[PDB]
Design a protein around this ligand. Structure first.
Ligand SMILES: CC(C)(COP(=O)(O)OP(=O)(O)OC[C@H]1O[C@@H](n2cnc3c(N)ncnc32)[C@H](O)[C@@H]1OP(=O)(O)O)[C@@H](O)C(=O)NCCC(=O)NCCS
Ligand SMILES: [Mg+2]
Ligand SMILES: [Mg+2]
Length: 720
């Protein structure tokens, strides 16, 4: 109670001061009125937030019980779901009306990067990732095998760099073909009569489609770069005969830059650990520096002191000679937490903590005002040309919960003195009660929705928890082939396209989690635009630039017109629970893999407040772990345990097997403290144990209650 009272709220000082001193100035909002609206909004919406949480609990207990009385009669099951209000009727057809949305969303198909907002260095990089080097992406990853002397080394390897160049030349041929011949034989480029002219050994050539020439830099007769466009994404050939790569190139080409992460999601949710006012202030401050345009982070390359800042916009000459400008930064969404958790950043008179999702709207809405204009006090950055603020709302269960978000935004808009529908919603489709009512969810947000996205990891976590009592589930790597998930994915696209999303809102698909396996990403992740998704999630800038390749090969707008108005998934498919028909080596492998990934993720969450980590699985595949991959592992094991496939002792023994391995993976991190051999003195080990043995008891299988409590424990113990 260094807490400032305002109405019935008791606001942590660090938050109060950050809001008044940093966030509020320049927004033209009177601070007294701000705080009294925070108070009114919290008092008015809290009881409905609680009622919606109680309803999830009520629905689950009814489902548990139904399974416990009960080979599933699917008609009887649908019926039961209809009677308790889980499965509601599908509304009449409609088209969404959302307006004031930027083209990066309504129109441009391309990769969407997600990043932990608490990590300024990564958050900057992500905003800067709208524009990335294809050469660095190819040279630095396994896309180009290290085969036939193309191995990376201390020095530029010309055998490898020549392979990169060729790979890029073919890409240029496929995306922006010349009228005659190949980019592989280009000797130079000029601009003549406002056309791109490409010099060959024969032969000068224009482009088969001259509308793919977007502009250039430098002199017409001797350009420093050539900007091209295909499928609404830009491609920049940098020309420099004198650069290290350029001198080795037939046309003195130094690099190919792809426009990649057209949008970026600055994440408050599953990729960060933020358990108290101090943690939330850290992320709100980074969100603030992003929208003001002044965020920075000291960066070290070869023991020289650099500063990472936001990219400035990019200046070009139009084909016909005028100057213009393309955005240097990807358009930023912010992902707020969902409806579940409270946070002690504010408590009321009785010391009850305030719902965090309510706070996130208020505070991330407030701070987003700075990126709606340029001024000294707002900073130079403008995030939206149309004045929209873009908020991803995760983990919603059903249309009532969407309507409640929309009402929250509406209430917040009045507090912030913003027009109604300024605050846009990106709806995660990642909970079962949302999937099976998806059209009504879209409908509840028909004037705010800017995206739907299959958050498949959370979605599998809910799948396991929802049917926890039905029997043992299949192994988690066997989920991808189950009818529920295949119908889920097609159904999401169907519903977005039937609601008129094409040309208006993103249809998005999920995250590639194998951070190092890029050759695989480039081979496999093309399926998502081919399925109609105008965007999909990538884990890094490098993965954005690589994924952009797929949007050049697939014409997603043409895909979408060819799928629109076609129903491909049925309710019954969507509701088919992934029940199993295992040898003990198969159970051992599943349990140990789940345990290893749990421990390796939780130990850095609890001990270090890192909410997204790269953690090798049992096969040494480096996986991106966040709360959602945790939700799956801990729910699958709780489900095996529930049904007697494994015992408690089994889980404990596995956890003891793998803790020493995680400790080894983490040695050479000077800040790491081992779990072994004193497992019970490890709050992080106990967290991982609790997530599994209490897993069935967690609401919707969510990991935040145990993780937030354990991280706070850990801070408290670090304090004395
Ligand atoms: C998995 C993850 C933690 C890997 O990062 P890591 O183990 O700490 O370190 P790596 O060596 O692989 O990469 C660090 C470098 O890549 C960049 N990087 C990695 N992920 C990035 C992201 N999302 N945005 C911007 N840059 C990123 C960093 O900026 C850094 O480059 P720099 O030295 O120039 O600053 C990570 O990619 C991440 O936190 N981001 C995306 C995941 C997400 O947001 N959701 C969770 C999905 S499972
Ligand atoms: Mg600004
Ligand atoms: Mg999710």
């Amino acid at each position: 109670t260094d807490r400032v009272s305002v109405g019935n709220l008791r606001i942590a000082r660090v938050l109060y001061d950050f809001v008044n001193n940093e966030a509020l100035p320049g927004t033209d909002i009177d601070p007294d009125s701000f705080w009294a609206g925070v108070d009114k909004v919290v008092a008015d919406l809290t009881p409905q937030n609680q009622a919606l949480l109680n309803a999830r609990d009520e629905l689950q207990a009814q489902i548990d019980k139904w399974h416990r009385r009960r080979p599933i009669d699917m008609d009887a099951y649908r019926q039961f779901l209809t009677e308790i209000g889980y499965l509601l009727p599908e509304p009449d057809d409609f088209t969404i009306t959302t307006s004031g949305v930027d083209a990066e969303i309504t129109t441009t198909a391309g990769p969407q990067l997600v990043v932990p907002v608490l990590n300024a260095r990564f958050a900057l990089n992500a905003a800067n990732a709208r524009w990335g080097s294809l050469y660095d992406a190819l040279y630095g990853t396994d896309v180009i095998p290290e085969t036939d002397g193309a191995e990376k080394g201390p020095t530029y390897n010309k055998v490898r760099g020549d392979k990169v160049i060729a790979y890029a030349r073919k890409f240029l041929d496929d995306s922006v073909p010349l009228s005659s011949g190949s980019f592989g034989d280009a000797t130079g480029f000029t601009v003549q009569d406002g056309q791109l002219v490409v010099a060959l050994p024969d032969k000068s050539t224009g482009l088969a489609n001259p509308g793919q020439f977007a502009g250039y830099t430098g002199a017409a007769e001797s350009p420093t770069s050539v900007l091209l466009i295909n499928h609404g994404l830009h491609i920049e050939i940098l020309i420099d005969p004198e650069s290290q790569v350029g001198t080795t190139d037939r046309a003195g080409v130094k690099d190919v830059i792809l426009e990649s992460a057209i949008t970026t999601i600055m994440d408050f949710e599953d990729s960060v650990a933020a358990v108290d006012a101090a943690d939330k202030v850290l992320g709100y401050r980074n969100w603030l520096g992003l929208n003001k345009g002044d965020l920075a982070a000291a960066v070290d390359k070869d023991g020289t002191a650099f500063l990472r800042v936001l990219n400035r916009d990019r200046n070009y000459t139009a084909p016909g000679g005028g100057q213009f400008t393309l955005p240097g930064r990807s358009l930023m969404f912010v992902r707020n937490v969902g409806h579940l958790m409270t946070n002690d950043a504010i408590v009321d008179t009785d010391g009850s903590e305030v719902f965090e999702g309510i706070m996130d709207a208020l505070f991330t809405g407030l701070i987003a005002i700075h990126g709606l204009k340029a001024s000294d006090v707002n900073g130079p950055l403008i995030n939206s040309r149309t004045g929209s603020i873009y908020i991803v709302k995760p983990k919603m269960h059903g249309p009532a919960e969407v309507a409640f978000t929309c009402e929250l935004f509406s209430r917040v808009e009045d507090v912030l003195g913003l027009p109604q529908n300024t605050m846009k919603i990106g709806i995660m489709d990642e909970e079962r009660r949302t999937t099976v009512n998806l059209k009504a969810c879209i409908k509840a947000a028909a004037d705010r929705v800017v995206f739907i996205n299959t958050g498949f990891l959370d979605r599998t976590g809910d799948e396991i928890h929802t049917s926890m009592e039905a029997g043992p589930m299949v192994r988690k790597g066997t989920m991808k082939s189950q009818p529920w998930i295949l119908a889920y994915e097609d159904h999401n696209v169907d519903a977005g396209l039937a609601a008129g999303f094409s040309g208006r809102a993103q249809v998005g698909k999920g995250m590639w989690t194998m951070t190092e396996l890029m050759a695989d990403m480039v081979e496999t992740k093309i399926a998502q635009p081919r399925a109609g998704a105008s965007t999909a999630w990538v884990p890094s800038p490098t993965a954005a630039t690589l994924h952009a390749l797929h949007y050049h090969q697939v014409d997603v707008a043409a895909v979408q017109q060819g799928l629109a108005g076609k129903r491909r998934a049925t309710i019954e498919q969507l509701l088919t629970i992934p029940l199993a028909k295992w040898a003990p080596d198969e159970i051992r492998e599943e349990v140990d893999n789940n345990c290893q990934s749990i421990l390796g993720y939780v130990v850095r969450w609890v001990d270090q407040g890192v909410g997204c980590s790269k953690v090798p699985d049992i096969h040494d595949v480096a996986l991106m772990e966040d709360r959602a991959t945790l939700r799956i592992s801990s729910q699958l094991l709780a489900n095996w345990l529930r049904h007697g496939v494994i015992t408690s002792a089994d889980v404990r023994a596995s956890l003891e097997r793998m803790a020493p391995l995680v400790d080894r993976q983490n040695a050479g991190d000077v800040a790491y403290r081992p779990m072994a051999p004193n497992f019970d003195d490890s709050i992080a080990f106990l967290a991982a144990q609790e997530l599994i043995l209490s897993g069935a008891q967690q609401p919707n299988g969510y990991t935040e209650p145990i993780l937030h409590r354990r991280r706070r424990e850990f801070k408290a113990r670090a304090a004395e």
